[PDB]
Amino acid sequence: EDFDTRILEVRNVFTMTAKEGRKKSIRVLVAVGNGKGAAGFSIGKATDRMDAFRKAKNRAVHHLHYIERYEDHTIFHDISLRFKRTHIKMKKQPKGYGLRCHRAIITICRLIGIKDMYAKVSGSINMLSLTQGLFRGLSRQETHQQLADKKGLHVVEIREECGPLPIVVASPRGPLRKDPEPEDEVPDVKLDWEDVKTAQGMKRSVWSNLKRAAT
Amino acid sequence: ETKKPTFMDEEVQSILTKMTGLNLQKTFKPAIQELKPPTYKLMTQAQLEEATRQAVEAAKVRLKMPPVLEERVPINDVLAEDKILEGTETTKYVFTDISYSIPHRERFIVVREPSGTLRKASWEERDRMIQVYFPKEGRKILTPIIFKEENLRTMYSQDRHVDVLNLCFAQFEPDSTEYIKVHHKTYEDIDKRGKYDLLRSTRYFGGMVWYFVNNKKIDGLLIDQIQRDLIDDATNLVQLYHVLHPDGQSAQGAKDQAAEGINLIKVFAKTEAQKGAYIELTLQTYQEALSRHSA
């Protein structure tokens, strides 16, 4: 009773049979989630649409991921991934930002319990790949605690709204290293041109930052 | 001969600075403003202590006490009286010198009245014109209605004293009548309802203490400090009172009895303090509790 189901896609797939010719089947993608991190998805197939809905709904609950939510409202860090030909680039956002993402990601996020996030889907906009990719990235996100333990260092959060106050969000449960992490003068990191282009005010889009209903 | 300390004396500043206190969580409380994704740094304990130290340094700048100034004297100086121009114009002309690199208090703002008198602008007109031409963030040309008695009492009912004080600092100049009035009426409400903790770890505590000491009503603040186990601050408050009222019964009492530490509170409680009985009871309770923890 805690879990809620929401349809993502309904497709009329067809095969050819010797006796009848075109045989119509229903392929249904559904996502189930209780809103507290536990969410899954499944594909249900049946000649009747009701049977397809049921099969997908009941099978999705046996394939539940657990999503680590930072402060139970957003992701811990920005996740960029490619699943097959679909690119999903998700950004961590502050409280009150909303779900500025593809309608399907909005639906899945509400089931997971993420309230604030931005995501841009590029490449193929296949619904199967998007869902499978979204759950792949969110499942693999590293929490602040896991980072502190791996690095043996404090994770200190700097917030602009709190000035210079150092907020320690995670500390290493084991021994704390005494050597500071080597500060590379120039980071050899791969930058997304779309990010850099926006930061330099070089991106004019009439469709970006349009006023939309509360999500 | 013997000059009584001013508010900006290093001694007074040290006393009032310590009395204020420094709660890093209150000074850097999260502001309800447009937000951005926070940043993260992997820091050692040594590095964490250095950042906290830098926050203490920044917080001490944010808490720098505004200087307490005496009410400015009205400007009433006539530069000229050209009686020939009487009756020619129906409205007065306000001429503001907008030369950029001039201190605002050194600018010439004059008014040609319909009678023909060229007079220097009043303090109020001067402040209005500087806002018209050199607009300051948070200042309005027309006095906001928040500063009316009825609107200021709602703010007090909600324990928004610091907000009233920040609004006043933005709107009015430190030596203006409106500025001094509002701070004096805020300080009074804090005293009546015992809300001294509202202004602690803020840049407005020193001014509140200065008002209380120079008006001889440090009783309520002393009680609160003792009830909160802040004897060091309470003793310093009594000491400061003596320095600003040296020819006083309590000052002579401490001199006669060479009182120090808690004794200063007792001497002041009986001689000058209006609520001598209540102070003794409050101080009594504390001293008893302290004796237990020592065991």
From Swiss-Prot, chain A:
Component of the mitochondrial small ribosomal subunit (mt-SSU). Mature mammalian 55S mitochondrial ribosomes consist of a small (28S) and a large (39S) subunit. The 28S small subunit contains a 12S ribosomal RNA (12S mt-rRNA) and 30 different proteins. The 39S large subunit contains a 16S rRNA (16S mt-rRNA), a copy of mitochondrial valine transfer RNA (mt-tRNA(Val)), which plays an integral structural role, and 52 different proteins. The gene is MRPS5. One of its GO terms (molecular function) is RNA binding. Residues 3-67 form the S5 DRBM domain. The keyword Mitochondrion applies. It is found in: Mitochondrion. The keyword Ribonucleoprotein applies. GO terms for cellular component: mitochondrial inner membrane; mitochondrial small ribosomal subunit; mitochondrion. It comes from Homo sapiens (Human). Its main location: mitochondrion. Belongs to the universal ribosomal protein uS5 family. This is Small ribosomal subunit protein uS5m. Keywords: Mitochondrion, Ribonucleoprotein, Ribosomal protein. The chain holds residues 216 to 430 of 430 of the full protein.
Curated annotation (Swiss-Prot), chain B:
GO terms for biological process: mitochondrial translation. One of its GO terms (molecular function) is structural constituent of ribosome. The modification N6-acetyllysine is found at K148. Keywords: Acetylation, Disease variant, Mitochondrion, Phosphoprotein, Primary mitochondrial disease, Ribonucleoprotein, Ribosomal protein. GO terms for cellular component: mitochondrial inner membrane; mitochondrial ribosome; mitochondrial small ribosomal subunit; mitochondrion. It is found in: Mitochondrion. It is linked to Combined oxidative phosphorylation deficiency 5: A mitochondrial disease resulting in severe metabolic acidosis, edema, hypertrophic cardiomyopathy, tubulopathy, and hypotonia. Ovarian dysgenesis 7: A form of ovarian dysgenesis, a disorder characterized by lack of spontaneous pubertal development, primary amenorrhea, uterine hypoplasia, and hypergonadotropic hypogonadism as a result of streak gonads. ODG7 is an autosomal recessive condition. Component of the mitochondrial small ribosomal subunit (mt-SSU). Mature mammalian 55S mitochondrial ribosomes consist of a small (28S) and a large (39S) subunit. The 28S small subunit contains a 12S ribosomal RNA (12S mt-rRNA) and 30 different proteins. The 39S large subunit contains a 16S rRNA (16S mt-rRNA), a copy of mitochondrial valine transfer RNA (mt-tRNA(Val)), which plays an integral structural role, and 52 different proteins. Belongs to the mitochondrion-specific ribosomal protein mS22 family. This is Small ribosomal subunit protein mS22. The lineage of its organism: Eukaryota, Metazoa, Chordata, Craniata, Vertebrata. The gene is MRPS22.
